[PDB]
Design a binder for this molecule. Structure first.
Ligand SMILES: [Cl-]
Ligand SMILES: [Cl-]
Ligand SMILES: [Cl-]
Ligand SMILES: [Cl-]
Lengths: 985, 986
């Protein structure tokens, strides 16, 4: 027997359709096709579609069309062609046959609005999704909801988060990986949570008429609306019922439970007769013993039971899971329902807590015992629940059903017990007693996010771009500030906060400072600073406490960038005097200034190699550069360094002798950190530190230029353990480590990116590196991280590849690294003397940006997939598809790059204004917010590339012409108009 | 707000029904009820049921009955009563109302055959299950299938196993935890595998008419039949189609894939017109990156793609998942289908490797794109597959569809690659080319399992008991021998073979030796012996290599029992001269005799405490006895012992000085091991070793009697770290560690069990311990492992418990320990001088056995649950429910106890015959096999307790009266008749 893989099947159905029917009928620009048999010999297809879409998949789903096609498809190839609003089927012999009337109607209905099969974005950037259409990808129809713990304790560690799909499916978490609603770990990326979560059934006379997660013949229209931090789903039934589901997380208030999700269900009777209905709201609680799910499911079942909840009047209101083991009694979950007939209030009348009893002989979509619940409290788990309530809807009236699903934790209370949960639940239910309270809370959420996004507002003509930046990107930046990489559609494991993830704060910081939350930014800075050891290295991860001390060599250097941004923007140098605990513990404290100095010393004097550059250690920002198999962490290095000092009679600050490899990216980060510290010291009137840092910066730049530049590129790694000279560096021409015979040497994008960002590379080096990037690192789908490399030569135990070509490490386009490179290109284009080179870099930067903007994913959704409102991780260079997860560094650097392209850069003297517009653009207007003032920026130019470095321009501030391009930060609480006009040449 | 837990809700619906209707109508012996509202104030129920069953749930599932009940509930309580073949509804005010005709008909239909709602057992012990009825428990409707790797390499590590439920759902594994069909790790115990596994749809004219996992209005009848190593499911449709699915694992043959599961689907047209139908067979391949499922699902999806398979003629035959990473490339999976119209052969015409496309806008039960597959090969995972084929069934004819789902592995081939899988698949498909080949293979499986269980055959009048022992228990013992505790309905993680699990071989050994596989038993013995270190300790776990050296103090001592059983039965002492590798590695080998001597020395001279008994170390057979928080494993103790010997100028064999605790269970195991080694040496003509072992046994018995007996019981552990005397022992009266104020001291069942089994306890001590057991350790649901204990005075970090009362460690009845105690009781009842004491112990033993026999679970299925063909782990002492998993030590010791109660015991001189029958029994007939002969045993007695120790009896062998009760092992290939008649008293 023989085997044929998916990738080895060269001929696609569309190619075969083009071959068979290309020269006989007009196939248009896009068409769809499907093989009619397992031999891949004949195809059935449809021609002239507005865009690529799985039209044949939907057509085969139709009984009439399938029946009609069955008389040709098995043996003959057919194609559908529309002429004069009339459909014909074309065979391989040229026969054109008019299809019957019913087939014609079915085809006309199907091909209608094909361009909207993936939904569309409103003027506010909200995604409107049809529930009956195929999904471009597992992440396309996903929305992320977050809580609000601002003004409370451990904001990062206690903010609730949730993921909601087009049908309301997903999971809900409270802190770390604590599950309120069960998460599903299965084979499919689409299944994030237990299927029963957030779903409900409506019964009329004991017979099911509605299920919230099934679109049947009784539903005439069903749509979902994904917006910022809330989801709305609307159904219309053939029996004239209007159903509206609104799902959102409750912002925290004093006395509330730690996590609470609210779903409001509005049932409106659009008929002229009163209807007596019943609602059954189902769900599944998440288990406390997550590990046991994979080890002992019986253990998870037998350690918990169900309990009923009653109010002060003795009426059943909800269910909770009760755990025996003490470790699982520190969190208490709850679900409650309330029914409002305008002003009358009623509570659920029945409940079920057994999945087997609920489903019975039916299925989850058609449960056999879904209407009449047995009211039996299960003695075991899992925490499945269903609450049933009857009600009556008068003609033209509406009934509301509010469901609160939440969790109380000991992480926010002392002497925690179930009594605490009961008290917090009582407070929550008292707060949401009136019907209008829910609407007020929703409006509060909406207004909070609208106001948060007002730090920077684009006002161009492109409504989609304006909405995507002003609302969607700002919300994603806030989300990645609170969570880092912990939760998502396919991010379901337990993850701690990585030290370098402070990169997120690079952007969100500004927003937070402009809604009066500067103290929150300071607290985040101090929390990160608390994870730096006395020597200078930092913990790699931390949620409640740090771990993995000094495992990676780059972690500590991002803190300098964060502090520089904060201090430059706010001018608040007092943070340097704050006493923060050191990661070593023992109740020792150190000033922030000393911690920054220690970081610089560790990365510049102690942990350095033979060439004076920082050591690679286990790895750096790039986790695949595991060159040294005998690497050591921070603590081992510290003890060995002290032993060396004692033995050699050295002094603290001397180099730690070894033959380990050196990282050039770390060298660039160190140079940038030293420059930032020099600027901070200058702002702090510390002249001695400023001049010392300036001299150290010059020394480090000289070392990098002398040892890292290799006549074609900046090397990525310097190798020191091969005395014979077989291998000495990696990441430039002549390194002898290229796995591609057509490429002489390996090239890393980060090399060029952070050589430009650190301000080490010169103009000639920038030009050479840009040429190399265009030659090798630039692909039709963007800038790839690195060219193929054969690391087995220098690291024998490097293992082999894990991914097909184009996926992740096998030549994919990582959007985070590409965005960093785009930042470097933007920075270079502002100051490079050569105008042609600047124009080329600007073109490359805009080309790369166009591949990352989420909204543009809706241009060809069924080819690029991704998500039209949330940034994804990487692009598959084999197919061009955008692949999750939804949380990554793409959003932060995209926001920074878009703001910098507008010309905004914060320096010691104010805003350094230097916009770089698109060639086709002729106008750019935006509004900027600042503590104590605001700006209205307008830029005008003719068609073509224009920049302040090599173009004639006029700049006015408040109507007064000015010469210097640095606009001061005003403090008069007024709005200042800035106008730039590029003269036509 | 306030909360009420399930256990705090004291009043049950049935109690309230009795209160409200008890004195007004006859409720019979059993009834069912449900609360009508969340306040638990009113009930609706039905009276006079044959047995407890969830009748009200089924009634609520009925639209007519629910509509009728809505007119009274939830405001008023109602009860259904059947008088004069007509149904009435009774209210709390005495009103009796005759229900309408439709309601009466529905109630009559539902109340019928309530006594068979959980199925029934055939005369062959096969479970017949109705697919429309509720499940007593998550394990009740489960069947386990195993392969056959006998005569091949690494039988334990390479035998395939599978679990099949009443609907055919489950998973399928090849070796270790390698998944052929996807396993599901979710919140529910019922979901063992992916829902689509082993399922198919039938379409007619493009419209779905049948789904194998859904019972709808088109299904008239649907039943499943669980038998030994095969499952059969039958459906009848309203359109006159008869569907039958037969699922079983293929026994291995040369050139076959390592794992292969075969499902045969027969479609018979019972109408008078030809039907043009289409079949779509679906499934999900298991992923190679199991950890990535919880870590990174995207990684799991992106590292694999789909590939199509074609035969020599170029015709599509199936799908396979193709992996890029090298680690997930040593195993290659496949699924293939073939359609037979009697003699004409055809292959699937379409396929769909994509769950989203298959389901479309519908569901898995009603897929939207299930009829017309898109024939698209997915570039990503997961390995979902559907194969579609059309066919035509003529009137009165049958169409067969054979599906082979399997896996080839590098564990059985050198230079493995995907080409090896193609070659093995070609061999398999060539073998199963004719239609009758599948039937021949099924008959071969059936005959093999029928012949395997002929070592011991009961021939009593109770057909259920005879089938449960002769067929079901034998198969379970074989299954546990091949898979110790690795796979099951709820045993879904990765587990290795524990050393203790050698206990399984205690039973299955005999069967194997009587089926021609003595060499297999020897290979298993040597494989276990290879995990014993030179010092004497053993690895705790091992699948391909051992791990955790000497982590537990009892592991090495079971090997002596295994060797004793084997050598005594076969008299093959040559195994003692075999050279086996030592667990230390370095290519060092040792003779078996020396390994046994080293085990004895380690447990008797080196690893001992202040009292001279074996050290507890981290723990012993009981994993909850973590008394010492500074325990060390075998290697640490070995290096410390060597440095101590060097420092103190000692010699090898001296005690390892320490203040660690001692285990009395280990002491009993050591005494039994020493006695066994003495007997082996005597059989081997090694007089010096026999004398040395006899003296050592006497000395160890003296130590145990002097330091372990505490005037009321045998202590469980001895404490040596408290010099002030605050605590010195645990497991007897006055130990000061009892957590129950009404019980003075803690008592362990294993203490008595292994004091009797090791032959250390005396008659007076046995009587005292039996009294204590009756006082404290005997409950209405059996013998509990241990009375409540504190264990916090001596171990500060002991935790606070994880289970509600009656579950596992919080007072449950563990069937394995109870069976060991029953073995001790049986052994004592045969030899104690006091006849009343023997009668009491026999009564207790039979009472405990009646709670463990799987078939009796069908007497009150909806209250005890369990499984009517497979033994479970423990009984919940709060409710009496039997709880899984299905694999445990219960089956082995139940088999041993049943055989011993029949009077069979193998000694040096032959069979020691000493039956112990039930008091009510008057006849016991059975047949026994020996490697060179066979016996027919018949025992007759009057009503009442009778034993050879205290009753007058006549024993005839081959018609000749004999005096000595030891029947020799004949070697003349004849059948010998043994008759034992107990004389009527007086
Ligand atoms: Cl995600
Ligand atoms: Cl890199
Ligand atoms: Cl199991
Ligand atoms: Cl024990």
């Amino acid at each position: 027997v023989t085997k044929v893989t998916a990738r080895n099947n060269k001929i696609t159905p569309v190619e075969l359709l083009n071959q068979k029917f290309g020269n006989k009928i007009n196939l248009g620009n896009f068409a769809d096709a499907v093989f009619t048999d397992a031999a891949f010999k004949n195809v059935a297809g449809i021609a002239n579609l507005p865009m690529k879409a799985p039209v044949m998949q939907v057509l085969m789903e139709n009984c009439i069309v399938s029946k009609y096609l069955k008389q040709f498809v098995p043996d003959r190839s057919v194609c559908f062609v529309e002429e004069g609003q009339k459909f014909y089927i074309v065979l391989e012999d040229g026969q054109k046959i008019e299809v019957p009337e019913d087939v014609n109607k079915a085809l006309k209905a199907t091909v209608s609005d094909v361009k909207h099969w993936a939904g569309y974005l409103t003027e506010d950037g909200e995604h409107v999704i049809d529930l009956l259409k195929p999904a471009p990808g597992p992440h396309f129809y996903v929305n992320l909801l977050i809580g609000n713990r601002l003004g409370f304790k451990r904001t990062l560690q206690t903010t609730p988060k949730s993921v909601v799909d087009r049908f309301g499916r997903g999971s809900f978490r409270s802190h770390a990986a604590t599950q309120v609603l069960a998460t599903r770990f299965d084979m499919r990326q689409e299944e994030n949570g237990f299927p029963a979560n957030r779903q409900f059934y409506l019964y009329e006379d004991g017979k099911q008429i509605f299920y919230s997660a099934l679109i049947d013949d009784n539903i005439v229209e069903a749509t979902c609306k994904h917006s910022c931090n809330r989801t709305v789903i609307k159904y219309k039934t053939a029996c004239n019922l209007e159903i509206t589901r609104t799902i959102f997380l409750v912002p925290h208030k004093k006395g509330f439970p730690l996590a609470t999700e609210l779903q409001r269900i509005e049932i409106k009777n659009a008929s002229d007769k009163a209807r007596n209905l019943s609602i059954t709201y189902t769900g599944m609680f998440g288990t406390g013993a997550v590990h046991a799910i994979f080890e002992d499911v019986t253990y998870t079942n037998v350690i918990m039971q169900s309990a009923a909840l009653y109010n002060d009047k003795g009426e059943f209101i909800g269910i909770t899971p009760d755990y025996y083991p003490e470790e699982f009694k520190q969190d208490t979950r709850f679900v409650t329902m309330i029914v409002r007939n305008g002003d009358e209030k009623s509570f659920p009348q029945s409940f079920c807590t057994d999945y087997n009893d609920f489903v019975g002989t039916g299925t989850l979509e058609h449960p056999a015992g879904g209407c009449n619940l047995n009211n039996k409290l299960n003695r075991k788990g899992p925490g499945f629940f269903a609450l049933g309530a009857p009600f009556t809807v008068e003609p033209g009236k509406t009934v509301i059903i509010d469901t609160f699903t939440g969790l109380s934790s000991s992480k926010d209370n002392e002497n925690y017990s179930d009594a605490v949960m009961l008290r917090e639940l009582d407070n929550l239910l008292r707060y949401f007693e009136k019907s209008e309270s829910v609407e007020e809370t929703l409006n509060e959420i909406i207004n909070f996010h609208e106001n948060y996004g007002k730090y920077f507002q684009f006002n161009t003509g492109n409504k989609l771009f304006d909405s995507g930046f002003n609302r969607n990107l700002a919300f994603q930046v806030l989300y990645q500030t609170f969570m880092s990489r912990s939760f998502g559609q396919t991010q379901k494991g337990y993850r701690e906060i990585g030290f370098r993830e402070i990169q997120d704060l690079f952007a969100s910081m500004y927003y937070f400072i402009n809604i009066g939350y500067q103290d929150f930014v300071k607290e985040l800075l101090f929390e990160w600073t608390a994870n730096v050891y006395k020597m200078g290295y930092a913990n790699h991860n931390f949620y409640w406490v740090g771990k993995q001390p000094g495992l990676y060599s780059d972690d500590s250097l991002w803190l300098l960038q964060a502090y520089y941004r904060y201090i430059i923007y706010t001018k608040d140098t007092s943070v340097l005097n704050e006493e923060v605990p050191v990661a070593d513990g023992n109740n020792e404290k150190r000033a922030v200034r000393e911690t920054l100095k220690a970081i610089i010393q560790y990365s510049a004097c102690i942990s350095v190699g033979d060439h004076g550059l920082p050591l690679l250690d286990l790895a750096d920002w790039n986790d695949c550069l595991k060159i040294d198999s005998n690497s050591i962490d921070g603590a081992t290095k510290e003890k060995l360094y002290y032993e060396q000092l004692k033995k050699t009679n050295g002094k603290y600050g001397d180099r730690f002798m070894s033959d380990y490899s050196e990282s050039v990216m770390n060298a660039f980060l160190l140079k940038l950190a030293i420059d930032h510290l020099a600027e901070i010291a200058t702002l702090d009137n510390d002249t001695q530190l400023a001049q010392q840092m300036s001299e150290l910066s010059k020394e480090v730049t000289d070392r990098i230029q002398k040892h890292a530049w290799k006549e074609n590129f900046f090397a990525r790694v310097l190798i020191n353990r091969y005395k014979d000279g077989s291998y000495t560096y990696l990441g430039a021409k002549g390194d002898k480590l290229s796995a591609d015979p057509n490429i002489d040497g390996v090239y890393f994008l980060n090399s060029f990116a952070w050589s430009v960002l650190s301000d080490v590379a010169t103009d000639e080096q920038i030009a050479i590196m840009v040429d190399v990037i265009k030659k090798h690192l630039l692909t039709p789908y963007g800038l790839r991280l690195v060219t193929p490399a054969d690391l087995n030569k220098i690291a024998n135990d490097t293992a082999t590849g894990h991914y097909f070509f184009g996926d992740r490490e096998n030549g994919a386009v990582f959007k985070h690294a590409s965005m960093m490179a785009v930042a470097a290109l933007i920075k270079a284009a502002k100051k490079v003397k050569d105008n042609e080179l600047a124009k080329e870099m600007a073109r490359i930067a805009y080309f790369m940006i166009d591949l990352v903007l989420p909204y543009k994913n809706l241009e060809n959704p069924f080819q690029v997939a991704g998500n039209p409102r949330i940034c994804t991780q990487y692009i598959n260079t084999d197919t061009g598809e955008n692949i999750g997860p939804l949380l990554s560094g793409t959003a932060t650097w995209l926001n920074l790059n878009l703001i910098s392209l507008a010309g905004i850069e914060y320096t010691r003297d104010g805003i350094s204004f230097n916009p770089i517009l698109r060639e086709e653009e002729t106008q750019l207007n935006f509004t900027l917010k600042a503590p104590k003032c605001s700006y209205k920026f307008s830029i005008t130019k003719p068609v073509g590339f224009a920049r302040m470095e090599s173009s004639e321009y006029e700049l006015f501030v408040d109507g007064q012409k000015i010469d210097n391009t640095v606009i001061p930060m005003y403090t008069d609480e007024k709005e200042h108009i800035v106008t730039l006009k590029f003269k036509h040449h």
